[PDB]
C-alpha cells in the first residue's frame with residue numbers, strides 16, 4: 001500500500017528515496033505504482049517539446065514547459081540543451097574541434113570530475129564503423145577520447161547479467177544475476193524481466209558502484225530509469241542534478257537507453273530500420289554534451305559510452321526442439337532461447353536422470369546447433385557454474401540459433417529477427433567502449449578488454465577503493481591519463497626446495513621399468529650442470545612462477561625443461577620449456593615406449609608409482625614436458641622421469657599427444673619460438689579457484705595420486721615475431737588454454753576422426769586468460785620480465801578468441 005495523496009512539489013527526481021506509504025517522486029516510482037498523484041504533471045512536463053527555437057529566446061519563464069529558453073534558465077539549471085545554440089549564438093559540441101583535455105576544467109566547488117555512464121542496450125561493436133555516418137556525436141567521443149575496437153561482455157550475453165557485471169566487476173556466477181530469467185532453489189523464488197520479484201534485494205549480490213560510492217562518501221545519481229520516462233527527460237534530469245549545490249550534487253550518474261536493442265530484436269542487427277535508432281541515440285549524446293557545455297562541464301566530466309552486449313541474426317525457423325531428442329520432454333523445465341538450462345520439472349520425480357538427458361542430447365544430429373554440458377564442463381573462460389541458480393545441465397547454443405522445449409513454445413507464447421545471449425567470444429555479441437574526459441587519454445586506441453575490468457576503473461575515476469571483484473586492478477591503467485592504480489606483485493608464500501641427488505635407484509619400489517642401463521667424463525660435467533640449472537635461462541624466460549599459498553615443493557632442473565614439483569600433489573604444479581623455431585620433433589624410441597624412471601632427487605614417498613596405473617583400468621599417464629621435443633637422445637631420458645608424469649585418461653591422451661607432438665612445433669614455427677608452461681588444475685567444486693587437497697574427489701586407484709580436472713598450457717613468444725621467443729626485447733604475445741581432463745571425447749562430435757580434424761577446435765573452445773590459470777592454480781606468472789607491471793597485467797587478462805575479423 002502507497003497512500004498516493006502527498007505531493008511531488010519541489011521533489012521531482014529526489015535523490016534519497018522515501019518509504020511507503022509515503023508517496024515517491026524518484027525515477028523508479030513508476031515501476032512500484034508509488035508515485036504521488038501529481039508526478040506526471042510536475043515531473044514529466046512535455047509542453048513545447050525539447051528544443052528552443054528563435055521565438056522562444058528570452059521568453060517569460062512558463063513553469064509548464066518541458067524545458068526553458070527564458071533568461072534565468074542557466075542559473076535555474078533547466079534550459080533546453082540547445083538553448084545557447086539557438087539563443088546565444090553558441091556552436092553545438094559536435095561542431096567544435098577536439099582539444100586535448102589535459103586537466104579537469106571544472107566550476108568552483110567541484111571536488112572531483114563527475115563520471116557519467118551512458119549505457120546503450122544491444123550496441124554491437126561494429127556499429128561504431130558501420131553506423132559512423134549517422135552518429136557524429138558518438139564518433140567525436142570515440143576518436144577524440146580513448147576507445148577499444150570492442151569490449152567483451154560476460155556470458156550469458158544478456159542485459160541483466162551484463163549491466164550488473166558492469167556495476168560490480170563480478171562474474172554473473174558471483175553477483176548472482178546469472179540470466180534474464182532464474183529460479184533460486186534455496187529461496188524457492190523465480191526472477192523474471194517482467195514483474196516484481198526482480199526488485200527484491202536478495203537477487204543482487206556483490207557491491208555495485210553506486211553503493212561503493214555512497215559508503216565512501218561519494219554521492220550517486222539514481223542509476224535506474226522507469227521505461228516511460230523519455231530519453232530527453234533523463235538527460236535534463238542528469239543536467240539538473242549537476243546544477244545542485246556542492247553538498248547535494250552527485251558525483252556519479254547513469255543514463256540507460258533501451259535502443260538499439262529494442263529495434264535489433266525486431267529487425268536484426270543491420271536491418272534498414274536500424275539507422276533511425278542509431279541517429280536517435282546520437283542525438284541524445286548530442287543533447288548531453290551540449291548541456292554539459294552550457295554548464296561549462298564539457299572539459300570537466302568523464303563520460304563513459306558503453307554497451308552491454310551485441311545483437312545477432314536469429315529467426316523462428318532456426319530453432320532446435322528438445323522434443324526432437326528427448327522422449328521424456330514433459331519431465332523437464334527448460335530456460336530457453338540463446339542458451340539452454342535444464343532442470344527436473346518436479347523434485348519428487350526420482351525417475352528423472354541428468355546422465356540420460358545429456359546422452360540423448362549429445363551429437364544426435366549431423367548439424368546439431370547446440371551442445372549439452374554439465375555446467376562444470378563448460379569452458380572455464382565462461383566462469384559459469386559456481387551458483388545454485390545455474391542448472392547442472394546447460395546447452396551452449398550456436399550463434400544464429402534458438403533452443404526450445406517443444407514447437408508449440410515458439411508459436412503459442414515470426415516476431416523477431418535479432419537476439420543475443422550466446423557465448424561471449426562470439427563477434428556479433430561484442431559491444432562498445434569509449435571513455436572521454438580529463439582522466440581518459442587523448443585520441444588513444446586501446447586493445448579489446450572484458451567488461452569485468454571497468455568497475456575498478458570507475459572506482460579509480462571517482463577515487464574509490466573497489467570492493468573485491470573479478471577485474472585485475474591495473475590491467476586497464478593504459479586507458480587513463482591520471483588516477484592510475486599502482487599494484488605490487490603478490491608476495492611469494494612458499495619458497496621452493498632445490499633437491500640434489502639424495503636417493504639410490506634401489507630405494508624405489510614403484511613398479512616402474514625403463515630400458516635405460518647404458519654406461520664419459522666430457523659429458524659428465526655436462527649432465528651435472530644441466531641438473532644444477534645451466535640451461536634454466538633458456539627454459540624459464542620470465543622467472544619462475546611464484547607460489548601464492550602454503551605448500552611443499554621442489555624446483556627440478558633438466559636440459560630441456562624446468563619444473564616446480566609438488567610433494568603434496570605428487571606431480572608438477574608447472575613445467576616450463578622453450579621450443580625454438582629450429583627445434584625438431586622426434587618420436588619415442590620403441591625400447592622407451594613404457595619407460596618410467598625414478599627421480600633420485602625426489603623421495604619414493606613423494607613419487608607417483610607405476611603400479612597404481614597398472615591397477616587403475618580407467619586411468620593412464622602422460623608427461624608434461626613432451627618426450628617428442630627432447631633436444632637429444634640422451635636428454636630424452638629426463639622426459640621419462642616419474643616426476644614429469646601426470647594422470648591421463650586414454651581419451652584425453654589423444655588430445656594431449658596431438659598438442660605435444662604436432663601443435664607445439666606448429667606454434668614455434670609460426671611464432672618464431674615459443675615458451676610453454678603446462679600443468680595440472682584441480683577444480684572439483686568448480687569455483688574457478690585452486691582446490692586444497694581435501695577437495696579432491698578422485699585419485700588414481702589405490703594411491704594418493706590426485707586426478708586433475710583440467711590441464712593448462714601458457715604459450716608465450718615475442719609480439720615482434722622477427723625476434724625469437726628466447727631473445728625478445730619488447731612486448732610479449734600469449735595464448736593459453738585450460739583443457740578439461742575428460743574420460744571421453746563426447747564434447748567433440750568428430751572425435752572418431754583423426755586428431756587433425758577436431759583437437760585444435762577443442763583447444764580453441766577452451767582458450768583461457770593467464771589470469772584464469774592463476775586463479776585455478778595459486779601461481780603468479782611473468783614475475784621477471786623487462787616489461788612494466790601494468791603491461792604484464794594487461795597481458796595476463798588477454799584472451800585469444802579465434803574469431804575471424
Ligand SMILES: *[C@@H]1O[C@H](CO)[C@@H](O[C@@H]2O[C@H](CO)[C@@H](O[C@@H]3O[C@H](CO[C@H]4O[C@H](CO)[C@@H](O)[C@H](O[C@H]5O[C@H](CO)[C@@H](O)[C@H](O)[C@@H]5O[C@H]5O[C@H](CO)[C@@H](O)[C@H](O)[C@@H]5O)[C@@H]4O)[C@@H](O)[C@H](O[C@H]4O[C@H](CO)[C@@H](O)[C@H](O)[C@@H]4O[C@H]4O[C@H](CO)[C@@H](O)[C@H](O)[C@@H]4O)[C@@H]3O)[C@H](O)[C@H]2NC(C)=O)[C@H](O)[C@H]1NC(C)=O
Nearest residue numbers: 173174175176204205206386387388468469470687688775
Ligand atoms: C570473483 O570475485 C569474487 C569477489 O572477490 C570472489 O568471490 C569471493 O570468494 C571468496 C572465496 O570463495 C568468498 O569468501 C567466502 O565468504 C563467505 C562469506 O560470505 C558472505 O559474505 C560476503 C562479504 O560481504 C558476501 O560477498 C557473500 O555474498 C555471496 O552470498 C550472497 C548470499 O548467499 C549472494 O547474494 C552473493 O551473490 C554471493 O554469492 C556468491 O558467493 C558465495 C560464496 O560466498 C557462493 O556460494 C555463491 O555461489 C555465489 O557465487 C556472502 O553473503 C565466508 O563465510 C567463507 O568462509 C569459509 O571459508 C573460509 C576460508 O577462509 C573458512 O576459514 C571459514 O571457516 C568458512 O568455512 C565455513 O563455511 C563453509 C561453507 O558453509 C563450511 O564448509 C565450513 O565447514 C565452515 O563452516 C569465505 O571466506 C567470497 O564470499 C566471494 N565473494 C563474492 C562477492 O562472491 C570469486 O572467488 C572470484 N572468482 C574468481 C574466479 O576469481
Ligand SMILES: C[C@@]12CN(C(=O)OCc3ccc(OC(F)(F)F)cc3)C[C@H]1CN(C(=O)c1ccc(S(N)(=O)=O)cc1)C2
Nearest residue numbers: 117119158159160163166167209223224225254255256261
Ligand atoms: C531495468 C531497466 C532500466 N535500466 C536502467 O535504467 O539501467 C541504468 C543502469 C546503467 C548502467 C549500469 O551499469 C553501470 F553501473 F556500470 F553503470 C547499471 C544500470 C536497466 C534496464 C534493463 N531493462 C529492460 O527492460 C531490459 C531490456 C532488454 C533486455 S534484453 N532482452 O536482455 O536485451 C533485458 C532487460 C529495464
Ligand SMILES: [Ca+2]
Nearest residue numbers: 683689690691
Ligand atoms: Ca576449486
Ligand SMILES: [Cl-]
Nearest residue numbers: 178179180181
Ligand atoms: Cl536467461
Ligand SMILES: [K+]
Nearest residue numbers: 613616619620
Ligand atoms: K591404467
Ligand code: NA
Nearest residue numbers: 745746748751
Ligand atoms: Na566424440
Ligand SMILES: [Zn+2]
Nearest residue numbers: 122261265420
Ligand atoms: Zn535484447
